[PDB]
Every structure is written in structure tokens, then in C-alpha cells.
Amino acid sequence: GSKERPEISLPSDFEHTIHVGFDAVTGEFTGIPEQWARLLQTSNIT
């Protein structure tokens, strides 16, 4: 593994990321909801 700038070429790779929340979310921060991981001990329903 090496860390170089923009090498000469670059074949794409497998799948990629997706986006599902609500228009203007990835570019919008409000209130102070969970960090998307504290669920290991949050106020879940169960």
C-alpha cells in the first residue's frame, strides 16, 4: 500500500456509497441526535 498523489491511471472499483435521508440532510445539521452508534446503550424501544 502506498500513499501517492494522483497517479497516472486509475481503474474504478467495486460498488460505491448510496444516499437516503431527506432532501437537504447531508448538507444540514440540526438539534443533537444520536451519533449513529450509541445505540449499544441508548433509549431503544425493545
Partner: protein, 178 residues
């Protein structure tokens, strides 16, 4: 070596990724921007160099439930953000991630940051710390923690004002592969 696992960490805040854009332009009003979810698991190929990538965001289906079974952070690189104006809060991570050791050996990188700091450094909100602790935490002092506990870098971000937080991720990218 190259395997990097990044997600939105901290003390319970919005997806840190929703800010990478706010610094770019969508801020947090009512503009048009890409959506929440973000599941990528692949390796890039540049000049013949494969890059190990691995990340994921809540809302696996807009219900924020497909990603609700997490109940456990499993991504070597964690982007956490806390404020320098809390009651002995910074003293709690010294005894939390240092005595616990990330994985007990690899000491995976930890992108330390400051939430809504763009003012927290003024002597007016600083007043609130006095009511509990007259010893506020500063960036020049937290560095010792990273260099004491072997973290990755102490940065700062302001979702809307933009505390040049591009360095919080930019420095966690080269430290993730370590």
C-alpha cells in the same frame, strides 16, 4: 495497512458527514443536497494501487432503521467531536480510550475535535465552565493527550461557520491505513 473503517462518532450528534458538506455549501437551512445513507465497501485502483475502503451511514432505507441494529461501533477510524466547555468532560476520555486502548494493541487513530467551537473559545461562554471547572481545555493541551495516548490528531470543526474541519477527515484518511 490500508483497511480503513470510518463512520460518524462523538458523544451523540448528527452524522458528522452531513457537515463535510455544510463546510462546502449546503450548511443547514433548506437547500438541495445528496441524501443521508452512505454504504461503500470496495477498493479503489489508482496507478495500480488498491485502496482499502469501508464506511456506512444510518438510514439504510430512509427509515433510519436498517442501520439501527448497530448497537456497536466497528470502524477503526472514529470521527468524534466534543466541546471544550463542559464539566470535566475531556478528563473522561483520558480514562476511557487510553486505559481501555482502542483494540488493546493497534491503537487505531482517533480524530479528536471540538463541536461548535466557533465561539467556545471566547471569554463569555467560557464563563459557564467556571461554575463547574475553572480549568478549560484548549487545543494546545489536548495534543499531549494524542501524543500521550497515541491518537491521530486534535482538530476542530463548526458545521455552519466552517472551522476548516477538512483537516479532521483529511488527516484521518492517511492515519486510517497507517
Amino acid at each position: 495497512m490500508q483497511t480503513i473503517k470510518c463512520v460518524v462518532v462523538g458523544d451523540g450528534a448528527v452524522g458528522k458527514t452531513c457537515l463535510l458538506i455544510s463546510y462546502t455549501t449546503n450548511k443547514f437551512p433548506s437547500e438541495y443536497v445528496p441524501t443521508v445513507f452512505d454504504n461503500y465497501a470496495v477498493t479503489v485502483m489508482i496507478g495500480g494501487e488498491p485502496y482499502t475502503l469501508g464506511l456506512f451511514d444510518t438510514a439504510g432505507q430512509e427509515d433510519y432503521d436498517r442501520l439501527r441494529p448497530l448497537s456497536y461501533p466497528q470502524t477503526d477510524v472514529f470521527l468524534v467531536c466534543f466541546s471544550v466547555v463542559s464539566p470535566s468532560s475531556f478528563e473522561n476520555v483520558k480514562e476511557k480510550w487510553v486505559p481501555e486502548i482502542t483494540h488493546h494493541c493497534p491503537k487505531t487513530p482517533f480524530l479528536l475535535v471540538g463541536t461548535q467551537i466557533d465561539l467556545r473559545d471566547d471569554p463569555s461562554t467560557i464563563e459557564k465552565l467556571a461554575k463547574n471547572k475553572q480549568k478549560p481545555i484548549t487545543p494546545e493541551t489536548a495534543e499531549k493527550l494524542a501524543r500521550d495516548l497515541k491518537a491521530v490528531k486534535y482538530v476542530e470543526c463548526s458545521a455552519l461557520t466552517q472551522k476548516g474541519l477538512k483537516n479532521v477527515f483529511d488527516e484521518a484518511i492517511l492515519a486510517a491505513l497507517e
